[model samples]
Target: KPNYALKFTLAGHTKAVSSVKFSPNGEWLASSSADKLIKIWGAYDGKFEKTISGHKLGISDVAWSSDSNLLVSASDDKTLKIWDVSSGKCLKTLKGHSNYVFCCNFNPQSNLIVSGSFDESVRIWDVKTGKCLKTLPAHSDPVSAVHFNRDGSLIVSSSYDGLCRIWDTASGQCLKTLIDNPPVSFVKFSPNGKYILAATLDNTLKLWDYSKGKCLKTYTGHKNEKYCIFANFSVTGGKWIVSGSEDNLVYIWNLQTKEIVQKLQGHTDVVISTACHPTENIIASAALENDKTIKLWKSDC
Candidate 1:
């Protein structure tokens, strides 16, 4: 069957866009750009719902709270901006990243937020108290990403140091660290939060049991060395793995079969991000081409 696409040409970004994410409820589209702006659009019609301008530098990533009331944005400005998803109002500024903030996420079980930055450290903060809880200085290079596991037991981070570290959120201890890949641009836990899937520029994806101490699977087969950037499993009951690469291609692999199930190609430059639809397997990818547009591709093969 022929794949389908829905073009979302958001006219606000002057430079290339970097990230596009669906809300946890799968109703709103929160997108960020190197043009230094973030916008929330209606996912169904691609209509511009609101534009938020708070990052003095460029926007790196955005996250919707599990409750879907607050929107958090990480930026090169070295700060995370909190906003009202419905009104586009600045709620508060959570500041502390010494360098550019690369990634940020909220823990669902609590009102806490964790962020990884170019400063080579990860910090935990109390969303209500506005205080830094744990400052993890483990990575030697820029911390590219930080993500919480499904159960909120461990927080995983990928860095330019070619290492992925899983930290126990309770005691702030580094549990298990994988030191065998090129720069890992992104890290994620499965929907169930049982397994940890880490992607790197080494042209391979590392899967580890977060509850255990060893690596389980080292999956490979990207088109180029710098091809791998970001990856994630399918939604709630999804049985596939999908990722975007610098080689300007995306691939979906079967979880049980451990084989590439489908290939998606569309971008003309570095494929920075690939966001799956919240409930379905549909994915959207964004690249840097100066024109700043998001390419939506269906990956349900």
Candidate 2:
């Protein structure tokens, strides 16, 4: 078995980093933060290239276009901004959120973007026209995360209401709800689109068979601290699960066995963001408090 080790850290943001994502081609990295700025970095070399500044309040989430030429950001200011990466110019401002927009992501086909907000709704926006397409009453409480399935036919959202709901994107109807006692902070679909991973606030990760609505596994080994912790399946084959915890560590768990595979540590504070390389062995993590760095890890075979 291979183990992961911290490769290096990229320091830039002065405030707590909210999320970090790689471009679709895995060449560039984008990070959003409470500093109200989105920093772009070279993915392979860790070079600080550009900073995007326009939001009036802290940025909560960011997503890259399928072509990797554009980026979209959700902010506490109740608006989203589409940016032209090469030009570093704000292309358009998407407005309509009644409260803080917590999370946003582009659809798999890149035709639209969906945003989850504290207003308890999810809004879909057209990419090219930057127009609000449809709004769905998603949750009873603030929605924390919204993600699209690989086919882009469905959207899964988690909320403070302690449930994960699946919605039909075309019809804007609730299809199924994965009920839990603890508030689910974030929810993500596996790359293969077979299962859903829900990050609950109580320091555990739950794997669910979305089709059957069955809980397949429960993983525990990290502290969540009521913060936004996220989990993702390894692009290497969906064999492992990677997540960050308030304990300042990145954990990798074997998908089938639900056993802790490894723990990659470096950050000195609550680790808020964690992700695996889409086509490589690399992993990335970011933290809050004393440390404001994004650390990358690689396999030590």
Best model number under lDDT = 2
Which numbered prediction scores highest in TM-score against the true structure?
Answer: 2
C-alpha TM-score for every candidate: 0.90, 0.97
Assess each prediction's global lDDT (C-alpha) against the native: 0.76, 0.88
Q: Model 2, residue 58: displacement in angstroms?
A: 0.5
Question: Where is model 1 more than 4 Å wrong at Cα?
Answer: 1-11, 223-228, 236-238, 299-301
Q: Write the per-residue lDDT of candidate 1 for residues 97-151, one digit (tens) a residue.
A: 7889888889876477889888999999887776788899969988878888877
What's model 1's TM-score? Answer: 0.90
Q: How accurate is candidate 1 locally (lDDT)?
A: 0.76
In model 2, the clashing pairs are: none
lDDT of candidate 2 over 254-293, digit per residue (tens): 8889988888878998888877777777787888858989
Could you give me the TM-score of model 2 versus the true structure? Answer: 0.97
